């Protein structure tokens, strides 16, 4: 399973590590960094909604620059969610619908998963 | 080996877990959450400095509180510096000289491991 160390959100600064994850508040939706190396949106504990797999994935961390950025273990970026601007505090929410979204300052949704499979 | 997704310095927000570390800028002093469930503050990968440990600590977060807590998978509490107050932003320095600081707005140090050990 994975640990929780910041419920369904990952602030400027967050980082999420292998065996940790963001949770939605139903519990049903799950953005995990897995010891594989894998970076995956599950639903149910059992369907795949969105990943990033085979790139040896270390972390993911929601940058003060406004980039949710997944690194391998030396640091080298595997997968950016290219949000970067000045709209700070920037979040990303792993929501009961299914979508995992970056929000800028002032609830601008600036970059989905695009995978509300829960209406 | 950690993995360091920080540097020397954990932000406001900013939580390492098992297998990650703080790194001095000179590469001798680590602060580590251990596979093995310890929390533990290095030099030279030899001479352990300080360290919380036998308590199944998961992670540790400089929380927007103030406060730098060590929590177990569950989210039960291991480890505090009670460092809590309304100085923003904190940051948990990993230093070169060997200790472990909290510094408050305005670079109070809040608390130390007093362990300064290199001169």
Same mark, same amino acid.
């Given at each position: 399973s994975y640990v929780h160390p910041y419920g369904s959100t990952l602030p400027e600064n967050g980082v999420i590590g292998r065996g940790y994850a963001l949770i939605s508040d139903s519990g049903r939706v799950e953005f995990r960094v897995t010891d594989e190396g894998n970076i995956q949106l599950f639903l149910d504990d059992?369907?795949?909604?969105w990943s990033v797999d085979g790139?040896?994935?270390?972390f993911v961390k929601m940058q003060t620059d406004g980039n949710c950025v997944g690194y391998d273990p030396n640091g @080298?970026?595997?997968? %950016?969610?290219? @949000?970067?601007?000045?709209? %700070?505090?920037y979040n990303l929410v792993c929501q009961n619908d299914g979508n995992l979204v970056v929000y800028a300052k002032g609830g601008k949704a600036v970059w989905h998963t695009n995978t509300a499979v829960v209406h």
């Open positions: 059992s369907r795949k909604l790139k040896n994935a270390s @080298t970026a595997v997968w %950016h969610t290219a @949000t970067n601007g000045d709209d %700070h505090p």
